Enzyme design. Structure first.
Site, PDB file in Angstrom:
ATOM      1  N   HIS A   1       0.824  -1.205   0.000  1.00  0.00           N
ATOM      2  CA  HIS A   1       0.000   0.000   0.000  1.00  0.00           C
ATOM      3  C   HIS A   1       0.861   1.258   0.000  1.00  0.00           C
ATOM      4  CE1 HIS A   1      -3.289  -2.798   1.145  1.00  0.00           C
ATOM      5  NE2 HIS A   1      -3.870  -2.011   0.256  1.00  0.00           N
TER       6      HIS A   1
ATOM      7  N   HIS B   1       1.348   1.244  -5.791  1.00  0.00           N
ATOM      8  CA  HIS B   1      -0.047   0.809  -5.843  1.00  0.00           C
ATOM      9  C   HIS B   1      -0.967   1.965  -6.237  1.00  0.00           C
ATOM     10  CE1 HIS B   1      -3.868  -0.948  -4.817  1.00  0.00           C
ATOM     11  NE2 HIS B   1      -4.065  -0.048  -3.864  1.00  0.00           N
TER      12      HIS B   1
ATOM     13  N   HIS C   1      -6.546   7.235  -2.848  1.00  0.00           N
ATOM     14  CA  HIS C   1      -7.462   6.314  -2.140  1.00  0.00           C
ATOM     15  C   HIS C   1      -6.802   5.489  -1.037  1.00  0.00           C
ATOM     16  CE1 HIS C   1      -5.738   2.960  -4.410  1.00  0.00           C
ATOM     17  NE2 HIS C   1      -6.413   2.160  -3.605  1.00  0.00           N
ATOM     18  N   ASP C   2      -5.455   5.402  -1.000  1.00  0.00           N
ATOM     19  CA  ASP C   2      -4.771   4.692   0.093  1.00  0.00           C
ATOM     20  C   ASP C   2      -3.708   5.552   0.767  1.00  0.00           C
ATOM     21  OD1 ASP C   2      -6.004   2.136   0.341  1.00  0.00           O
ATOM     22  OD2 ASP C   2      -4.814   1.335  -1.333  1.00  0.00           O
TER      23      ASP C   2
ATOM     24  N   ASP D   1      -8.736  -1.209  -8.000  1.00  0.00           N
ATOM     25  CA  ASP D   1      -8.082  -1.612  -6.756  1.00  0.00           C
ATOM     26  C   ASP D   1      -7.848  -3.119  -6.707  1.00  0.00           C
ATOM     27  OD1 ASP D   1      -7.019  -0.743  -4.237  1.00  0.00           O
ATOM     28  OD2 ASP D   1      -9.003  -0.917  -3.250  1.00  0.00           O
TER      29      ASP D   1
ATOM     30  N   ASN E   1      -4.975  -6.479  -9.713  1.00  0.00           N
ATOM     31  CA  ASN E   1      -3.681  -7.150  -9.854  1.00  0.00           C
ATOM     32  C   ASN E   1      -3.780  -8.515 -10.541  1.00  0.00           C
ATOM     33  OD1 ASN E   1      -2.528  -6.212  -6.479  1.00  0.00           O
ATOM     34  ND2 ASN E   1      -2.610  -4.944  -8.342  1.00  0.00           N
TER      35      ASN E   1
ATOM     36  N   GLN F   1      -4.163 -17.023  -3.402  1.00  0.00           N
ATOM     37  CA  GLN F   1      -4.477 -16.289  -4.634  1.00  0.00           C
ATOM     38  C   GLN F   1      -5.625 -16.951  -5.401  1.00  0.00           C
ATOM     39  OE1 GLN F   1      -2.667 -13.141  -3.750  1.00  0.00           O
ATOM     40  NE2 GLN F   1      -3.586 -13.189  -5.799  1.00  0.00           N
TER      41      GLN F   1
ATOM     42  N   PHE G   1      -8.705 -16.063  -3.658  1.00  0.00           N
ATOM     43  CA  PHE G   1      -8.982 -14.637  -3.872  1.00  0.00           C
ATOM     44  C   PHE G   1      -9.646 -14.417  -5.225  1.00  0.00           C
ATOM     45  CE2 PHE G   1      -6.701 -10.367  -4.967  1.00  0.00           C
ATOM     46  CZ  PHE G   1      -7.569  -9.562  -4.263  1.00  0.00           C
TER      47      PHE G   1
HETATM   48  C1  LIG Z   1      -4.989 -13.272  -1.114  1.00  0.00           C
HETATM   49  C2  LIG Z   1      -5.315 -11.795  -1.084  1.00  0.00           C
HETATM   50  O1  LIG Z   1      -4.555 -11.170  -2.133  1.00  0.00           O
HETATM   51  C3  LIG Z   1      -4.630  -9.809  -2.247  1.00  0.00           C
HETATM   52  C4  LIG Z   1      -5.385  -8.986  -1.412  1.00  0.00           C
HETATM   53  C5  LIG Z   1      -5.415  -7.608  -1.623  1.00  0.00           C
HETATM   54  C6  LIG Z   1      -6.216  -6.697  -0.700  1.00  0.00           C
HETATM   55  C7  LIG Z   1      -7.141  -5.684  -1.398  1.00  0.00           C
HETATM   56  S1  LIG Z   1      -7.602  -4.451  -0.183  1.00  0.00           S
HETATM   57  C8  LIG Z   1      -8.546  -3.271  -1.071  1.00  0.00           C
HETATM   58  O2  LIG Z   1      -6.409  -3.842   0.338  1.00  0.00           O
HETATM   59  O3  LIG Z   1      -8.431  -5.062   0.824  1.00  0.00           O
HETATM   60  N1  LIG Z   1      -6.912  -7.438   0.367  1.00  0.00           N
HETATM   61  C9  LIG Z   1      -8.145  -8.098   0.220  1.00  0.00           C
HETATM   62  O4  LIG Z   1      -8.794  -8.197  -0.806  1.00  0.00           O
HETATM   63  C10 LIG Z   1      -8.459  -8.668   1.556  1.00  0.00           C
HETATM   64  C11 LIG Z   1      -9.521  -9.461   1.942  1.00  0.00           C
HETATM   65  C12 LIG Z   1      -9.521  -9.889   3.267  1.00  0.00           C
HETATM   66  C13 LIG Z   1      -8.513  -9.532   4.150  1.00  0.00           C
HETATM   67  C14 LIG Z   1      -7.455  -8.723   3.757  1.00  0.00           C
HETATM   68  N2  LIG Z   1      -6.404  -8.331   4.622  1.00  0.00           N
HETATM   69  C15 LIG Z   1      -5.915  -8.962   5.713  1.00  0.00           C
HETATM   70  C16 LIG Z   1      -4.823  -8.217   6.419  1.00  0.00           C
HETATM   71  O5  LIG Z   1      -6.287 -10.080   6.069  1.00  0.00           O
HETATM   72  C17 LIG Z   1      -7.432  -8.303   2.424  1.00  0.00           C
HETATM   73  C18 LIG Z   1      -6.463  -7.446   1.698  1.00  0.00           C
HETATM   74  O6  LIG Z   1      -5.492  -6.817   2.150  1.00  0.00           O
HETATM   75  C19 LIG Z   1      -4.649  -7.064  -2.638  1.00  0.00           C
HETATM   76  C20 LIG Z   1      -3.884  -7.866  -3.479  1.00  0.00           C
HETATM   77  C21 LIG Z   1      -3.858  -9.236  -3.282  1.00  0.00           C
HETATM   78  O7  LIG Z   1      -3.162 -10.117  -4.059  1.00  0.00           O
HETATM   79  C22 LIG Z   1      -2.286  -9.574  -5.059  1.00  0.00           C
HETATM   80 MG   LIG Z   2      -7.578   0.873   0.611  1.00  0.00          MG
HETATM   81 ZN   LIG Z   3      -5.877   0.212  -2.728  1.00  0.00          ZN
END
Ligand SMILES: CCOc1cc([C@@H](CS(C)(=O)=O)N2C(=O)c3cccc(NC(C)=O)c3C2=O)ccc1OC
Ligand SMILES: [Mg+2]
Ligand SMILES: [Zn+2]
Ligand SMILES: CCOc1cc([C@@H](CS(C)(=O)=O)N2C(=O)c3cccc(NC(C)=O)c3C2=O)ccc1OC
Ligand SMILES: [Mg+2]
Ligand SMILES: [Mg+2]
Ligand SMILES: [Zn+2]
Lengths: 325, 326
Positions: A73, A77, A113-114, A231, A234, A282, A285
């Site tokens: 962040h 980003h 935004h961050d 956002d 990725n 991933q 996700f």
């Molecule tokens: C496997 C997750 O992979 C990624 C996640 C993200 C980011 C996007 S955000 C807008 O910052 O929330 N993200 C999630 O979506 C998310 C859901 C729940 C919990 C969580 N954080 C923790 C500390 O538990 C996250 C998180 O930080 C960005 C890029 C990623 O992979 C490249």
């Molecule tokens: Mg954010």
């Molecule tokens: Zn962001």
């Protein structure tokens, strides 16, 4: 003569800009150079009478308030989300949907935004009784802070890039930016996606497939989902970029898990470097968040998102193949 | 301490609608919020239930009360004390007997005590229009109400002020969420949707075999507490007329001081804020007709017939103010 940087910036209208290379070549100023490029490309300095030196001063100030020791962040980003939003705004299905002020709001919201992100989640801030969570009453704690910082910095010397907007233009832009950045809180993802789905099911288009959005409620929802898609873009980028984003978010998660372990807190999911499966996380996700979102977006702008969706599906297949049987 | 005797006598009325709260403010040395909260906590046995040390309670209440502005005409410690005491009476309505837990009761009363702390005596819209630091901090969204919560919770961290020190972690987490939900519901930009939901609950209401309201999920429970404290906040026109008229005098002074700030800036003076062109009586009749009576008649429906005397007083006061117009 930093010619290579200008060469890289000629891909600013393309999904898959070499943003880490730009960060390197610009002296760690990707947010400043990419915002400046996009503003020129969209004629936004002439349209809103933004003095170039004020723009550059604000952008460097803003970029300075992204933390250089936060792995994900950070200002790279922010630049990535800006540039991704800039491409989605040019979706052919969204031609003529958004005003110049709406375009400016989406791009400015993406840039801020961050800002000043500490590299830990809202839930960590709540659980540690942080000053941020106390200020914001546990509700969109980080997102409210990013907005407050982003707007406060306009008040620094020679930083008011909106100085020549009318009084009513400033009020409208501020409201739109707040609505957009608050929608980047992941606690809002499911409601946002449900509304995007509703819109897809009731969408009106021209004969040439261009979306028709008459009321503010629908337009702001599309802008909220657009910056949210950016956002969460990725996994939809070429794999060499995506794998770097995965490395960074995992480093940030693990640093949060180390703070949690040391405090004797429950280590949050995916944050335990001694018990983590990067690749399975991933794929999950993508399967549960990113692909439902981008599949719904692709339906809204059908068929203009197909290449992006193709890349996401290729990348999901690849990450799955790195998981042994 | 003849004065202390008179104060004690006045505080015997803490369970009554129409408590002499301005007299208590004078008799207590401008500590109405401290003495009314302490009386109510003793009356409900809250110090014993939640193991609250009496010295911690008084220390916190005095600090909270200090963070109300003594120079604001309406949104000061007397208003806070009044909303606390009004919520305490509403909590005792027969239709809610044994409905709420001790923690929910604690949350409603604490929320009422903090709900306007550090109010500067100008509206959210004034703070937004003037690019204030508060509106910048809070992104123009429930600006004051978010601030009141942040101040009220932060003061628990001052020396010997944590009145919740002996709650469990789950109790503290639950109380914090309920208090946030309740104070955010005092933002008037939420009134119409809050009232709409209360009406829907009245139309669908379920009563137990003992005749009390059945509330069997967080959503319904917190909605009743939100509307209860909002009714307390909007209770001035339901009080005996000599109290109501003092509240009207005070809110108009605060409005006029705001409109003077808007005058000294070239802004369009806000409605009701122009001391050169206001109709105090028409404004109270409008306030009752469009906001206060629609709310209280619905609350009265929810707890029918428990609040009939309060509603009758409101309707009498509306007639009185109307009679001063022709
Ligand atoms: C496997 C997750 O992979 C990624 C996640 C993200 C980011 C996007 S955000 C807008 O910052 O929330 N993200 C999630 O979506 C998310 C859901 C729940 C919990 C969580 N954080 C923790 C500390 O538990 C996250 C998180 O930080 C960005 C890029 C990623 O992979 C490249
Ligand atoms: Mg954010
Ligand atoms: Zn962001
Ligand atoms: C005639 C209004 O009378 C009263 C009003 C109030 C308070 C209650 S609140 C919870 O603080 O909002 N109140 C409103 O309800 C209201 C609605 C819209 C605008 C407005 N403020 C301005 C500056 O325009 C107010 C306002 O300050 C309390 C007591 C009152 O009469 C005794
Ligand atoms: Mg004070
Ligand atoms: Mg208030
Ligand atoms: Zn109040």
């Amino acid at each position: 003569q930093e010619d290579v940087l200008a060469k890289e910036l000629e891909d600013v209208n393309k999904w898959g800009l070499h943003v880490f290379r730009i960060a390197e070549l610009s002296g760690n100023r990707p947010l400043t150079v990419i915002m400046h490029t996009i503003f020129q490309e969209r004629d936004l300095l002439k349209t809103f009478k933004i003095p170039v030196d004020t723009l550059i001063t604000y952008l460097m100030t803003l970029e300075d308030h992204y933390h250089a020791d936060v792995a994900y962040h950070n200002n790279i980003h922010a630049a990535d989300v800006v540039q991704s939003t800039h491409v989605l705004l040019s979706t052919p299905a969204l031609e003529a949907v958004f005003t110049d002020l709406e375009i400016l709001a989406a791009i400015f919201a993406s840039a801020i935004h961050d800002v000043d992100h500490p590299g830990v989640s809202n839930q960590f801030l709540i659980n540690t009784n942080s000053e941020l969570a106390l200020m914001y009453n546990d509700s969109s704690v980080l997102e409210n802070h990013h907005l407050a910082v982003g707007f406060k910095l306009l008040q620094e010397e020679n930083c008011d890039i909106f100085q020549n907007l009318t009084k009513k233009q400033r009020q409208s832009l501020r409201k739109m930016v707040i609505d957009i950045v608050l929608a980047t809180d992941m606690s809002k993802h499911m409601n946002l996606l449900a509304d995007l789905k509703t819109m897809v099911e009731t969408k009106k288009v021209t004969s040439s497939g261009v979306l028709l959005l008459d009321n503010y409620s629908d337009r702001i929802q599309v802008l909220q989902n657009m910056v949210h898609c950016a956002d969460l873009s990725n996994p939809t980028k070429p794999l060499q970029l995506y794998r770097q984003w995965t490395d960074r978010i995992m480093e940030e998660f693990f640093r949060q898990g180390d703070r949690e372990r040391e405090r004797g807190m429950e280590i949050s999911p995916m944050c335990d470097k001694h018990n983590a499966s990067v690749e399975k996380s991933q794929v999950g996700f993508i399967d549960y968040i990113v692909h439902p979102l981008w599949e719904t977006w692709a339906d809204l702008v059908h068929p203009d998102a197909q290449d992006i969706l193709d890349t996401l599906e290729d990348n999901r297949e690849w990450y799955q193949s790195t998981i042994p049987q």
